[PDB]
Symmetry: C2
Subunit: 225 residues, 2 copies
C-alpha cells in the first residue's frame, strides 16, 4: 500500500491522531459537529462509521468521486462557541473509485482541453459526473499536468486537492471564523483493510489558522496494526 | 395530517402494501436491488431504514429536497433476471424540508420567471440548490401554476412530480426493460410519526407497464396504527 501512498495510516490510527490534535485545540467529541464528504460508493462506510462514533453530532454529504454539490445551502443546513470539523476523502482500491476510473479513461482519450467547460455548466442527465469531470479537467490544466502520465492514484490525488479547494470555498461562505472555530482534514481513503492517507490538516480557532502534521503525532499503540 | 395529504399512510402500512403488490409481480426482498432518493436531511432516516430492512441489496442517493444529481452514471453505478425498485420522496413536517421552504419564499418573492434558467446551468457555489430551484421553476411554469397561491405542501407536491419525472428520464437511459423488470414508487414523506403519501406507483415486467393503486391494497392489520 505504502508503495503508492507513503503517508497512508490505518483508519483507527488516523482517528486517534486526529482526536489527539483536536483536543489540543479545545475540540471534543461532544462540543463539535463534524461533517463528512465521501464518494457515494458503499465501500466508504468504515471511515464514516468511525467518524460518527467519534462525534456526538455528525452530518454527511456524498457524490460521485466525493464531488461537492451541496453548496453553501447544503452546508449551512447540515450545521445544528461553535465548533466544526470538515472531513473529505475520495477513495481508491489497492491490493474504487469507479467514477474516478471513468474520468481517467476519458481524460486520456480526449484532451484535457476537450473535457474542460466553464464553471456553472453541466450535463442535464449527468449532473454530478459532468461537474466532477469538469473540475478535474480545469484543475489538471491549472497545474500543467499531463493526463497521459497520470495513473488512477495520481488522479484520486488530484481529486482530493480539487475537492479540498471546493470545500474551502464553501466554508468561507458558510462559517464566521470570528464566532466559530473549525478544523479541516482531508486526504485519500484506501481499501485493501481500510486506510487514510492524510494530505491536508489545519485548524482555525479565533480566526487564526494553524497547520497540523498528523504524521508527526505519536500514535496510540492500541489503535495501530 | 390527512387534512393535507388524503392518501397519507403510516410508513409500515406503506411498506406492507408495497411488499404485497411487488410479490404479486415476482419481486422478492431477496431478488431485488432497491434504490432510494430522499432529502439530505437527518429526519428522512426512518423510510430509509425500513426500505433497506425490506431488501437484501439497497443503494441510496440524496440531495437538497431530494433533487436528483447522480445522473445515469450514479444510477448505473449503484446497481449490483434483473429486478429493481425505485423509491423517491421529498419530505415535509406537519403537526422540513428546509430547502423546499427556501424555494417557496424565493419563488414568491421574484417571479416564477426570474427563477427559471435553461437546463444545464447552475450556480458554482450552490449547485444542488440552484438545480433544484430551477427544475421547480420550469415545472411550475409548465403547469400554469401560480406560486402566489401555493403553500409548502403544494410545493413539496410539485417537487415530487418533478423528481418523479427526472427519475423516469434516468431509468430509461440506465435500464433495459427487455432484460430487467422494475418498479417505481414515489410520493411524499411526512413527519409528525412518519407517513408516506403515495402518488405514483407502477411496475414494468417484460417491457410492459402496469399501474398500481396502493390505496386499494388491503392493509396488514399488524402494520397499521
Ligand atoms: Zn467511488
Ligand atoms: Zn429536506
Amino acid at each position: 500500500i505504502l508503495r503508492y501512498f507513503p503517508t497512508a495510516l490505518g483508519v483507527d490510527d488516523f482517528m486517534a491522531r486526529t482526536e489527539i490534535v483536536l483536543g489540543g485545540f479545545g475540540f471534543t467529541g461532544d462540543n463539535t459537529i463534524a461533517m463528512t464528504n465521501l464518494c457515494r460508493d458503499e465501500v466508504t462506510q468504515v471511515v464514516k462509521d468511525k467518524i460518527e462514533a467519534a462525534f456526538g453530532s455528525s452530518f454527511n454529504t456524498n457524490g460521485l468521486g466525493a464531488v461537492l454539490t451541496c453548496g453553501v445551502t447544503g452546508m449551512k443546513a447540515g450545521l445544528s462557541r461553535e465548533r466544526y470539523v470538515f472531513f473529505a476523502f475520495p477513495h481508491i482500491a489497492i491490493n474504487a473509485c469507479g467514477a474516478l476510473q471513468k474520468c481517467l479513461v476519458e481524460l486520456k482519450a480526449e484532451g484535457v482541453d476537450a473535457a474542460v467547460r466553464a464553471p456553472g455548466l453541466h450535463d442535464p442527465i449527468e449532473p454530478e459526473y459532468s461537474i466532477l469531470k469538469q473540475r478535474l479537467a480545469r484543475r489538471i490544466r491549472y497545474e500543467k499536468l499531463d493526463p497521459q502520465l497520470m495513473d488512477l492514484p495520481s488522479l484520486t490525488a488530484l481529486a482530493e486537492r480539487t475537492i479540498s479547494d471546493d470545500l474551502e470555498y464553501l466554508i468561507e461562505k458558510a462559517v464566521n471564523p470570528a464566532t466559530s472555530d473549525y478544523a479541516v482534514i482531508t486526504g485519500v481513503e484506501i481499501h485493501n483493510m481500510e486506510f487514510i492517507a492524510p494530505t491536508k490538516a489545519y485548524v482555525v480557532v479565533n480566526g487564526v489558522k494553524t497547520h497540523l502534521d498528523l504524521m508527526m503525532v505519536p500514535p496510540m499503540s492500541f489503535r495501530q496494526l
